[PDB]
Each structure stands twice: as structure tokens, then as C-alpha cells.
Design a protein around this ligand. Structure first.
Ligand SMILES: CC1(C)[C@H](C(=O)O)N2C(=O)[C@@H](NC(=O)Cc3ccccc3)[C@H]2[S@H]1O
Ligand SMILES: [Ca+2]
Lengths: 557, 207
């Protein structure tokens, strides 16, 4: 998920512009739901995942908001000490304490039901147990007990009319979520919201802690410690699930890193290109970042250095010249199937080879496979979510930076060989692999483009529609499932706020018993593919002027 | 007037709810959701509470157990019971609104029941506040705020120490899964602020 918030000092013909692209994967019917609420203190418009009571994406005519997943480390595992003499108990603060437990029965269509037990300790639900070591692992969440409060925080924030009112609700949202603010006066802000534990001294948050009591969290850190900024001197706020702030630690997931190589830099490059950005320019960042190969910038310099003394006829050199002439923006040919340039395939084969020769070889099996992915791994349905720089590539980037990297290279990933030799060998592999598939004339290579699919199964892999309701788009675009933009105090309108979004395939998922799809079942599909957008109305007069239908209900609680 | 809820849909079908109190506002929202996305919502409910196998069969048992194993429903219910009347009206209005439409659907299924119910062989039941809460818990909290690989991390660290020795193994862990990396691009620039805490990076909890 990406977001760029452009404040007063960076906006052209407006005081502030907010552009959000939450990346949740692509589904039919739509992941998010468009909704306007007016009355009982609310006056809001936007869209939100699974129609939560709180709109994650929207505005209220005074302020606007959005989010990106935070990925802070708000989860730790406690290793509970068990005893075969006392089943169902664990040692905590010097006593054997009873676990909580509950029975659950799974009822099964055309099958036999199954019952199992869920166990829970003071540290959380038990994930797994090792009878061999008499250890049970419990998952502790900093937000445990604040789930409902988090839902309400996302609802009450919609009534905020300024930064202090909004941050009062941001402090109540306990999940690890980046929240963003913009307003009519051109103020912008960000808060890496959530509950984070205050860990004991010596606790390495990447690895399990004993559950016997000494390693218990002291409590939760105060709101003052959450990363936040209001009207930053840069004039903008950009995020693509990258680090919130200097020295802030990421999720403990082994495949997730905040390092020198980060896809958010593609947004910064576009924001810094021009002194000010108009709303149309800010929207156009979606199309550019959507099509941007993320590895070209990271590895082109290394490739250029490795091939700099090669003769013109050396194929290792000709692959790199091809990359040098490219800005990394992919575009479809007219067949709607292949990319105009072959650079992503060149980088994918090269990077795969590189990782196998370097990070993969340094890591013992079977953990080595966590580092072998190039970042280009798909499905013939296309990527299930955003594309990113792989973990292995982020680690390789640090190695190729030499002493520019702040990470000690405890193991030389090049194993005593000159980096150039390994880069070149990987280039030799790349030429062999691609030239065998496509021949030796690089200029006619028509490499496959990724496609995009609006899946009929939800993210859990559970049907949310019939399989024929799956929708297909030729161009994969590394962008939000939805995109929304809010423009504050435009100089081109007297309205204090203008806002747009796109919710594809459409607002409705309704299909009548006879197969007749709703009139709003697929009317935003083309608009999504072409980077179009629809107006989000807020005022009674705007809503009335664009009214298709209305119902009036009379209800008593 | 206290009872009135006006629903206006725009030219893309997006609904705008007009109401005069909290319960009625959220009832209107629930109602339009039940009109637009009933099957999606029903299936989301089953996904978030691990009741998919009930309608879809044996291929979803493990899935349902895994969902139920990762939450404690009575705790969620205890949080709902602690809500003030105004907060409770959000969740109750929303469930009540969906129910009003669900009831209309089950009264005239020949024109109002989403086709997918016929296809998958079941009909929709009413909703409660807990169900609305659980949509958010299961698709937000659990999807995006419940990520840890510490047990796998420890397995990696153990393998690294077996291959390189205790000290080099820990240093290689710190090269592949660094705690922090100062060259990471940060949304907040360093001139604005930096995070003030420093963390142990040598597994000193078991030292
Ligand atoms: C790590 C991920 C698998 C993937 C990635 O970074 O490779 N990311 C996203 O889109 C970002 N997802 C979101 O930001 C989703 C989100 C959540 C809450 C509010 C808005 C957007 C992360 S996870 O999916
Ligand atoms: Ca952790």
C-alpha cells in the first residue's frame, strides 16, 4: 500500500493533496465498499474494506484520512514451560498456572464434524507445542483486548476537524497501521499508530522469550513514542510500507526488511522531481509507480560497473546496455500480452542467479529457500498483491554497496570472489537462458507481461462469488486495490475539498436469482484499468444533483 | 423524524445515508451493505469465524480450525459488553440494518436472494454486533497486524550457529535479519525526529 500526502509548500493550485493506494489484492466483488454517512455528528464520504463502520479512506469536508499497513513489531512469542506431570498447566511467576481452554466443533457440509481444543495462557493463544521439550508457544499481541476499541477509533476519527481531535482517536487505534491526515488549511500529518510493548531490557524482539515471568512485557509504550510528524519540513509524507522513522524497528517476519533498498524511493523520486505538484500530477504518480520495475534502480549501477570494460560484442554488456536505455517503466505492446522492453525479464533471471550464488549459498538448508525469490514470482492470474523488492535482493543490495552499507557483512556473500566475477557470471546465465528462449536479437524479444485478476475467492481463499465472476485485466499495475485522492482548497474551484476514488469492479455485487447482474456490478472496471476516477460527493446539493435513486425508511429501535 | 432514514444512491450506485441518531445512521449503512454485498459479507463472516466448512465442505476444515485457534471469541464479546450505549449503537445499528434487508430477502427469495446462495446451497441468517466486530478483527487485525515468524527465526539462528559458530552465527543472523538498518528510507525525515529506543540484538533473553 502506498500513500503520498502533499502539503502547502509542495502543492500546486491547492493547499494539500492526499493520494492513497491501499494494496489488499484484487477481488470480485470489490474489496472495499463506497459509502457516505450524514447525521449523528458524521458528514463523510469515501470507501472502506469489508464495509467496516469506520471508513479507512475518506474525508469529511474539513480533513481527509487514509492508511497503509504499519508492519511494526507488535507481536512476540512466549515459550511456556510445561510439565508432563501437570498437563494443561504452565509455570508463571513461580506457580503452576492453569491454561484457559475451549472446545470447538467444526461442522462440515457432506462430512463428519470435528472437535478440537484451543488453549490460551496469560501471553495469548497457544500456537504449537513440543511434547519433546515440554514447551508450548503462545502468541502475544500488544493490541490484545483493544480490537473493538480499534474499530471504534477508526469510526470516531471521521468526526475530527483538526490534528488534535484526530490524533486523540489515532491514539486509540491499537493495530500496527500507518494513519495519514490532510486538511483544508493545508496541514498534513502522519502517525504510525498502534500499541507496542515496553519490553524488558535484553529482549531481542525478533526471537521468542521465556514465558516463566521474568521476560514478560512491562506494559505498553505510551502514545508519545509512536512515530508521528505534523507539517514536515519536506512538505510531503510518502509511504509504501517502508520504515516510519530513523531507528524504528520492523516487524520480526524474516521476509520483511527496512533497508537501503526500498520501493518507497520510487515515490520520492517523483515527488522531488518538480518543486510543486498539481492534483493531476499527484494522481499520475499512481500510473508511474504502477509500472515501475523496482529492481532496475538498485542494481543497474552494479551491472554497469561489472560490464564497463567489456567489448561491444560481449552479450553480458549488451544486456546491460539494454537496461541502461530504459527507465524501468513497463508498457504493453499492442498484443496486450507482452511488454515493450525485456528489462524485467533480464533483471529477474539475473537476480535469481545472483541470489542462488550469494545469499542462498550462505544460508543452511532449508532456510536458504527464504532468500531465493527474486520479487517477480507470480501466478498465470498475475500477482496476488503488490510487487516489492525481495528479502534476498535487499540483503544482496547491502552486499553490493560495500562499505556504503551500515550492515556488517559477517559472512562475505561473494565467498572471497570479486563481486564483478559473480555479477558477470550471473549475466552469462541470463544471456544463456533468455537467448535460448527468444533468440539472439534482443530488440525483437517479446517478454510476457504480468496480468491482473479480480479474484472470486477472498484473500483467505474462500469463495465470495462464483468462479465465473472472476474479472481479468490485461495490465498488471502495482497499485492500490482502490485509489482515492482528496484535494484541499483548490485554487480552481471555490469548494474547500474535491475528492475522487475508484472501486472496481463496481459498487454492487448483487446478482438476482435469474442471473441478472446489478446495474452497478461492473461499471468501474474500465475506469480502474485506464487510471480514471469518479467524484466522491459529500454535500447534500452535490449528492442530490447526482442522484440515481432514493429510499426513505421509517424505523423504530 | 427520529425514525427516518433517507438512502440516496449516486450514478455509480454509491449510497449516502441520512439519519438523525447513531443507531439509525448505522442501520442505514448495514441495510445498504446487505443490498449490495450480502454474499460477500456472509462469506466474510464465515471466513472470520471459521464456519466455512459448514457450507463448503471438507476442504475448509483445516482453514476453520486455524481461524478459531487464532482468536478468543469470549474476549471479543467482553469488549462489546463494555461499550457505552453510543458505541454499542454503532455495531447494533449496523447489524440491525443488515437484518432488516436479510429478512426481506428470506421473505421473497424468488426475486431478492443473491444467486450465489442458490448456487452454493444455503440461505443467509441474521447478524449481531459480534459478527460486525469480527469482520474487522478477522480481515484487518489478523490480516495486517498479527505477523510474527519468531519460531522460524530461532530455527534460522540455530542453523546459522551450527554452520558458523555461536558468534559468527549470531552476526550472520544480524546481516540477514537486521534489527534496524540506518540507511532505510523513512517516512519521517531524521531532521524531524528519530525513535529513541535501542533494542538487544543478540537474543539476550536466553543468555
Ligand atoms: C508485506 C505485504 C505482504 C505487502 C508487501 O509489502 O510486500 N504489503 C502491502 O500492500 C501492505 N499491505 C497493506 O498495506 C494493507 C493495508 C492495511 C491496512 C490499511 C491499509 C492498507 C504490505 S502486506 O500486505
Ligand atoms: Ca516480535
Amino acid at each position: 500500500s502506498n500513500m503520498w500526502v502533499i502539503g502547502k509548500s509542495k502543492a500546486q493550485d491547492a493547499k494539500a493533496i492526499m493520494v492513497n493506494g491501499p494494496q489488499f489484492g484484487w477481488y470480485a466483488p470489490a474489496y472495499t465498499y463506497g459509502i457516505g454517512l450524514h447525521g449523528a455528528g458524521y458528514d463523510v464520504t469515501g470507501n472502506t474494506p469489508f464495509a467496516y463502520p469506520g471508513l479507512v479512506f475518506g474525508h469529511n469536508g474539513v480533513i481527509s484520512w487514509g492508511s497503509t499497513a504499519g508492519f511494526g513489531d507488535d507481536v512476540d512469542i512466549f515459550a511456556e514451560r510445561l510439565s508432563a506431570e501437570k498437563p494443561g498447566y504452565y509455570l508463571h511467576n513461580g506457580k503452576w498456572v492453569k491454561m484457559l481452554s475451549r472446545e470447538e466443533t467444526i461442522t462440515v457440509k457432506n462430512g463428519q464434524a470435528e472437535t478440537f481444543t484451543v488453549w490460551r495462557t496469560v501471553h495469548g493463544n497457544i500456537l504449537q507445542t513440543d511434547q519433546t521439550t515440554q514447551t508450548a508457544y503462545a502468541k502475544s499481541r500488544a493490541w490484545d483486548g483493544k480490537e473493538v476499541a480499534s474499530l471504534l477509533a477508526w469510526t470516531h476519527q471521521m468526526k475530527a476537524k483538526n490534528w488534535q481531535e484526530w490524533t486523540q482517536q489515532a491514539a486509540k487505534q491499537a493495530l500496527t497501521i500507518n494513519w495519514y491526515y490532510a486538511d483544508v488549511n493545508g496541514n498534513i500529518g502522519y502517525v504510525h499508530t498502534g500499541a507496542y510493548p515496553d519490553r524488558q531490557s535484553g529482549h531481542d524482539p525478533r526471537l521468542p522469550v521465556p514465558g516463566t515471568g521474568k521476560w514478560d512485557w512491562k506494559g505498553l509504550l505510551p502514545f508519545e513514542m509512536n512515530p508521528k510528524v505534523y507539517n514536515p519540513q519536506s512538505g510531503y509524507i510518502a509511504n509504501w510500507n517502508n520504515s516510519p522513522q530513523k531507528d524504528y524497528p520492523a516487524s520480526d517476519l524474516f521476509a520483511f526488511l527496512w533497508g537501503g533498498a526500498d520501493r518507497v524511493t520510487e515515490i520520492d523520486r517523483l515527488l522531488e522531481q518538480k518543486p510543486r505538484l498539481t492534483a493531476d500530477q499527484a494522481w499520475d504518480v499512481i500510473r508511474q509507480t504502477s509500472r515501475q520495475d523496482l529492481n532496475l534502480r538498485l542494481f543497474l549501477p552494479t551491472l554497469q560497473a561489472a560490464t564497463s570494460g567489456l567489448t561491444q560484442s560481449d552479450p553480458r554488456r549488451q544486456l546491460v546496455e539494454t537496461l541502461t536505455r530504459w527507465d524501468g517503466i513497463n508498457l504493453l505492446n499492442d498484443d496486450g500480452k507482452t511488454w515493450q522492453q525485456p528489462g524485467s525479464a533480464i533483471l529477474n533471471v539475473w537476480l535469481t542467479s545472483m541470489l542462488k550464488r550469494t545469499v542462498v549459498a550462505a544460508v543452511p538448508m532449508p532456510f536458504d529457500k527464504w532468500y531465493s525469490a527474486s520479487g517477480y514470482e507470480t501466478t498465470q492470474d498475475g500477482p496476488t498483491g503488490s510487487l516489492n523488492i525481495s528479502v534476498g535482493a535487499k540483503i544482496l543490495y547491502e552486499a553490493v554497496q560495500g562499505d556504503k552499507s551500515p550492515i556488517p557483512q559477517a559472512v562475505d556473500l561473494f565467498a572471497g570472489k570479486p563481486q564483478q566475477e559473480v555479477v558477470l557470471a550471473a549475466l552469462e546465465d541470463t544471456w544463456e537462458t533468455l537467448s535460448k528462449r527468444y533468440g539472439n536479437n534482443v530488440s525483437n524479444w517479446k517478454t510476457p507481461a504480468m496480468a491482473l485478476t479480480f479474484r472470486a475467492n477472498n484473500f483467505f481463499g474462500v469463495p465470495q462469488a462464483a468462479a465465473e465472476e472472476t474479472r481479468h485485466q490485461a495490465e498488471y499495475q502495482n497499485r492500490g486495490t482502490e485509489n482515492d485522492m482528496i484535494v484541499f482548497s483548490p485554487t480552481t474551484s471555490d469548494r474547500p475539498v474535491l475528492a475522487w476514488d475508484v472501486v472496481a469492479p463496481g459498487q454492487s455485487g448483487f446478482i438476482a436469482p435469474d442471473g441478472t447482474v446489478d446495474k452497478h456490478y461492473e461499471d468501474q472496471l474500465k475506469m480502474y484499468e485506464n487510471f480514471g476516477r469518479k467524484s466522491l460527493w459529500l454535500t447534500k446539493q452535490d449528492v442530490e444533483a447526482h442522484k440515481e435513486s432514493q429510499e426513505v425508511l421509517h424505523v423504530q429501535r | 423524524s427520529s425514525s427516518e432514514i433517507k438512502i440516496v444512491r449516486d450514478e455509480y450506485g454509491m449510497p449516502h445515508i441520512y439519519a438523525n441518531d447513531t443507531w439509525h445512521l448505522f442501520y442505514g449503512y448495514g441495510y445498504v451493505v446487505a443490498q449490495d454485498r450480502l454474499f460477500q459479507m456472509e462469506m466474510a463472516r464465515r471466513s472470520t469465524q471459521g464456519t466455512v466448512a459448514e457450507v463448503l465442505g471438507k476442504d475448509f476444515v483445516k482453514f476453520d480450525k486455524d481461524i478459531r485457534r487464532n482468536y478468543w471469541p469470549d474476549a471479543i464479546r467482553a469488549q462489546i459488553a463494555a461499550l457505552s450505549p453510543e458505541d454499542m449503537s454503532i455495531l447494533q445499528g449496523y447489524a440491525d440494518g443488515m437484518n432488516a434487508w436479510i429478512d426481506k430477502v428470506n421473505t421473497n427469495p424468488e426475486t431478492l436472494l443473491p444467486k450465489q446462495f442458490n448456487t452454493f446451497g444455503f440461505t443467509p441468517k441474521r447478524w449481531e454486533p459480534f459478527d460486525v466486530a469480527m469482520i474487522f478483527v478477522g480481515t484487518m487485525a489478523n490480516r495486517f497486524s498479527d505477523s510474527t515468524s519468531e519460531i522460524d527465526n530461532l530455527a534460522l539462528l540455530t542453523a546459522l550457529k551450527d554452520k558458523y559458530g555461536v558468534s559468527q552465527g549470531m552476526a550472520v543472523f544480524n546481516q540477514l535479519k537486521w534489527l534496524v538498518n540506518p540507511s532505510a528510507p523513512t517516512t519521517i525525515a531524521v531532521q524531524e525526529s528519530n525513535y529513541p529506543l535501542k533494542f538487544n540484538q543478540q537474543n539476550s533473553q536466553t543468555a
